Structures are given as structure tokens and as C-alpha cells.
Write a protein that binds this DNA or RNA. Structure first.
Length: 436
RNA sequence: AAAAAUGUGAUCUUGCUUGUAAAUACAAUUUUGAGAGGUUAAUAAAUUACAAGUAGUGCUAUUUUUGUAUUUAGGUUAGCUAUUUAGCUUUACGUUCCAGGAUGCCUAGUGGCAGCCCCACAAUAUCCAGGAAGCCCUCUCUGCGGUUAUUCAGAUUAGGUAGUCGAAAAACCUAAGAAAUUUACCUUAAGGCUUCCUCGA
């Protein structure tokens, strides 16, 4: 957990994904390997050796060469490291085709950030970036509490990554005491005392959840048996404003990386559901503002860039599937530089770059996507960047008018764009000139 | 050394046994491979002096004379072996090397030899046959050499895993196996397939 250092890793990952997708390999020449942490190398190596034997049996005399080369290449890199480093390793090997019929060979190994037990090895015509994108996802990990009579274990789950933080054990007074009699329910009193310790333990677990007056995980899930967790969940000290956040309580038996794991799996599907309703709560708030007719909320692709420059927008909303990117255009005269936002249809015809309705003359030299730009620069703007999907009806509503981007203002501002959107000076060509 | 003899009762000074004092090479060969603790154990003779007993002698014990001088010297501690002739150990009797002292006897001559104490006649037993080196067994180096946790990293294999071999090796040690190899098992998803009627200036 290091500031900015994590971001650098993210940068390399996104760059890698774009390059991996661009390159296409014929046949079975493309090999992708992901090695999880605390996973023995020898099992992996043996698996690679077994794969090598299979290729020989193929008898292709063409395909076999390509398959053997890929296998041998990955093995050489594997040989260099005696024991696997924490957070695992990712290795890509194979043969790819580049511009002008040139052959390009690739050997990349690096230490991935926070990927546990991916166990992915595939033979295919292209590299798989799905594991890489998991790291990139907006949600911030899952926090799990597994509670049992004989002990308590704490850990976190991110994507398909399993983490164990810390565990401890306490004991309830199990032996009643046949020989000594108090006869009166001193034991009940003892139980009551036990009850307070269970409460305190709850209180301590909660303390773990929040550090630095902040919460470690977006969602926290607790599990247990004999209703210790249900009781555990509702108490004044235990909630710490986090009680509302927890969705499912799951009854478990024989907990100890057994049955306890099952509780985690069911809770996660629901936790994803809370995000859907969390967005909905935002939505209800959004509609109330609409009723108000303040006009504080803005819309339009160009409006958002302008909104950030102003710095008046508290919340920035973007979609992963963004159909709008930033393109720089050269005038026929060559004396003037032009900036415009283009739809995928417009983006595809790079050489003409002309709108049918007006006959506009545009030439495209270099393009910079808006999604990557907004995420990198939101901090200087002061706005908060949030990512949402169009699955929700409200998301669809944004699509009909505003588009792939959304914006929220701290204070009511008229802004610029279409007349419904704001001021009439919707577009400008000033930015292109600075670059050139 | 041989001889008057009062004597001490005429007599002798005790080879014997008993108690006291001191002689009777070291090293090598074997044996622990070595150094070496256990050279473990056990337990050995004789010559001279004193007392007792007495085997001796009467304990103690005395005189004259003779003799340069009877001084000797040499050797024995001979053994074993063979029917006989004769052969023939530095003495082992764990193994092995080396003393050999006492008694008394034979060489004081005779034959050979210049001569002799030499060879023969060499001579009878004969106390100890002693001393020395060597610990059939315990620790160290480990003499068999081994025997090990293993890491390997390799070798060897078509290659893999194991074994074997090698290597870096935790450790341990132990009374000369005089040691031996055949070593396996694992994996191959589809492999490529045609013959019709000139007998052409």
C-alpha cells in the first residue's frame, strides 16, 4: 500500500493491455501464463514439460515448432526465478505479426499487483488481458470476517484474489463444573460476562474495519454460527456507521477455511447488488434535484471538459465503454488547427474526417481518448471520478442526451454547450493550436 | 693350599631346609596398521654372610708345621633327534631374539697336535631353563571403510520421475564383507493412396 507507486503499476498494466490486444498470433503460437503467489514453481515447470511432450505427439511439423518454441521460451524465464515472489508473476510468450510483414518476438515477465490464485495458462491465437483488467476495476476489494466459537479469522477478497490478514482465538467457559456448586446461576452471570466479551470482540473487529478515520473495503461481510454474528451485528459500539453496509449474514458450521469460504461466495453476489442500489440512492437524489429545476447538473461531452476547468464539479461520472474520444484536426488551409469530439462512426473514417450534413474539412494526425485523460487528471481539477454502467434505466437516460460522460456541481453553474445544456459557446478550436 | 696337636666332652665349621640383604643385556621377529590404556594375568632362581634345626657336624670352637703357589685355567646348566652310525638348538616351554650364574663333574694325563686347559678321552647330572621383545582386549587417527539427514547441480536418458553414479554435505565412527548391481516406470489423439480406346509417310 504505497501512494503513487500503485498508480505507476496501473499505468504499465493499461499500456500492456492495449499492446497485447493489438497483436494477433496465427494458430496456437500465442501463450499466456499467470503464476499466483505461494504456488510452487516445480508443479508449473512439470506442467510445462508435460505440455512439451504433447506437442511432439501432434506431428504437425509446422504447428509443433511454434508450440514448442512458445513452451521453451516461457520455461527459460521461469528458470530464472527459484521461488515465486509475493502477488505472483505474469509472463507472456509467443510469436506475433507486425506492420510490413515483420516478425516480432515477445518475452515479458513482471510482478503483478494484488493478483492471487489466478492459475491461468492458455493456448490460443491471442493473449488474454482479462486478468489484467480485474486489477483495473473501480470497486475497492471485499472485507470478510469469519466467526466461530473456537476462534476468529480475518481476511479480504478482491476479484478472484484471496487474502488473509490476521486471526486469533478465545475460549468460552466450556466446562460447567459438576463437582463445585454455586447452584444459583452464577454461570448465567458468567455467560452474561461472556456476552460482553463477544460484544467487545465485535467492537475490536469493527476497529479493524476502520483505520485513519477511513474504511479499508467498500463492502464488509461477517459470518458465524449459533447466531453469534446476528447478535454481533447489532450493538451501539459495533456498528461504527458500517452496520448499514453489511448485506448478508450467513449461517455456517465447522468454520475454518471450510464452510466459512462458502459464506463469502454468497455474500459477494449480494454485495454487487448493494452497489446497484447505492447507485439507485444517488439516482433518487438526482431526480429530486431535477424536481427542484436548479439546473445545477450539466450535460454534453464538451461541457464536461469545460466543467472540470472551472473546478466547480464535485462529482465526475464516466462509463468504461466510452464512445467519445479527443481528436486533433488540420484545416485544408493549414493555417488553422481544430478540436472536436467524435462518435465511433466518425472516428472510424480517419482519412476523410468529414460530416455529411455540412461538408466540414478535417484531417486527423493524433488522437487521445477521453476516458484515460479524465482518470489521470481528475485530482488537479478537484473533481471525484466515478465509473458507472448503462445497465440501469438512469444510465440509459444519460446515453439518450448527455452521452458517455456525466457531471455533478458543488454549486449551481450555467456552464457552456447546447442551450438546454448551458451557454451557446459549445465548441472551440483553441486546444489544437497549443499542441502544434 | 697340605701335615704337629692341648683344647672348647675326642670333633666339623653346615652340599640341606627355614627367616634377613644383592647378580642373573637391550633390541629385533610377532603382536592393535599405528599411538600403546592392560606390553593385562600370574608370579619367578641362585651364589656369598648370620641364627635355628639338624641333612652336616658334638653348638660354641683352638694350635704347630708345610706350601711363591696345588693358584689353575677351560668348559657343563648341552639339548633334541636316529635302529645304528650319527645327526644336531645362540635356550623356548603364544610367537620370537638373547644370559646363561650354582652345584658337581670332565679336560689337568693319555692318542693327534709344536704346544695346550685345544680335538678325542670331551665330562654326570644339573637349581632357574632366566631376561628381553609381544597386551588373544579398551580410547584416539579411523586399518577394514564405511556409514549417514541431505542439498543437489550435475552425470546418465529420446526426454521425464525415481533409482544408480557424482558433487557440495548435518552428523556419526571403529576393529580388516575384503563387498555389487544390469534399474525400472512413464508419453505419444487422428499419418499420406488416380487410369483411360491411334496400330503417329
Amino acid at each position: 500500500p504505497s501512494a503513487a507507486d500503485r498508480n505507476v503499476e496501473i499505468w504499465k498494466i493499461k499500456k500492456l493491455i492495449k499492446s497485447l490486444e493489438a497483436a494477433r498470433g496465427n494458430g496456437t503460437s500465442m501463450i499466456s501464463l499467470i503464476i499466483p503467489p505461494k504456488d510452487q514453481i516445480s508443479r508449473v515447470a512439470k506442467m510445462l514439460a508435460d505440455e512439451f511432450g504433447t506437442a511432439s505427439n501432434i506431428k504437425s511439423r509446422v504447428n509443433r515448432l511454434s508450440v514448442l518454441g512458445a513452451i521453451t521460451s516461457v520455461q527459460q524465464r521461469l528458470k530464472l526465478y527459484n521461488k515465486v515472489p509475493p502477488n505472483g508473476l505474469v509472463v507472456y510468450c509467443g510469436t506475433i505479426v507486425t506492420e510490413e510483414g515483420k516478425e516480432k518476438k515477445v518475452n515479458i515477465d513482471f510482478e503483478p499487483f494484488k493478483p492471487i490464485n489466478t492459475s491461468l495458462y492458455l493456448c490460443d491465437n491471442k493473449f488474454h488481458t482479462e486478468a489484467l483488467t480485474a486489477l483495473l476495476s473501480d470497486d475497492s476489494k471485499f472485507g470478510f470476517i469469519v466467526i466461530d466459537g473456537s476462534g476468529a479469522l480475518f481476511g479480504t477478497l478482491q476479484g478472484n484474489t484471496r487474502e488473509v490478514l490476521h486471526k486469533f482465538t478465545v475460549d468460552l467457559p466450556k466446562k460447567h463444573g459438576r463437582g463445585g456448586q454455586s447452584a444459583l446461576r452464577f454461570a448465567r452471570l458468567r455467560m452474561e460476562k461472556r456476552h460482553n466479551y463477544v460484544r467487545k470482540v465485535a467492537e475490536t473487529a469493527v476497529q479493524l474495519f476502520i483505520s485513519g478515520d477511513k474504511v479499508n473495503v467498500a463492502g464488509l461481510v461477517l459470518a458465524g454460527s449459533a447466531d453469534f454474528k446476528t447478535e454481533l451485528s447489532q450493538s451501539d459500539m459495533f456498528d461504527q456507521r458500517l452496520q448499514s453496509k453489511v448485506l448478508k449474514l450467513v449461517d455456517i458450521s465447522y468454520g475454518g477455511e471450510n464452510g466459512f469460504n462458502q459464506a463469502i461466495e454468497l455474500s459477494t453476489e449480494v454485495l454487487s447488488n448493494v452497489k446497484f442500489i447505492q447507485e439507485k440512492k444517488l439516482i433518487g437524489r438526482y431526480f429530486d434535484e431535477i424536481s427542484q429545476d436548479t439546473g445545477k447538473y450539466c450535460f454534453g461531452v464538451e461541457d464536461t471538459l469545460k466543467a472540470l476547468e472551472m473546478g466547480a464539479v464535485e462529482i465526475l461520472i464516466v462509463y468504461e465503454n466510452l464512445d467519445i474520444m479527443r481528436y486533433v484536426l488540420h484545416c485544408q488551409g493549414t493555417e488553422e488547427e481544430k478540436i472536436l469530439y467524435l462518435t465511433p462512426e466518425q472516428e472510424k473514417d480517419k482519412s476523410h474526417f468529414t460530416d455529411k450534413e455540412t461538408g466540414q474539412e478535417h484531417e486527423l494526425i493524433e488522437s487521445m481518448p477521453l476516458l484515460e485523460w479524465f482518470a489521470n487528471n481528475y485530482k488537479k481539477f478537484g473533481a471525484t471520478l466515478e465509473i458507472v454502467t448503462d445497465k440501469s434505466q438512469e444510465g440509459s437516460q444519460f446515453v439518450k442526451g448527455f452521452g458517455g460522460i456525466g457531471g455533478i456541481l458543488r454549486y449551481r453553474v450555467d456552464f457552456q454547450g447546447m442551450e438546454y445544456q448551458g451557454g451557446d459557446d459549445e465548441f472551440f478550436d483553441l486546444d489544437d493550436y497549443l499542441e502544434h
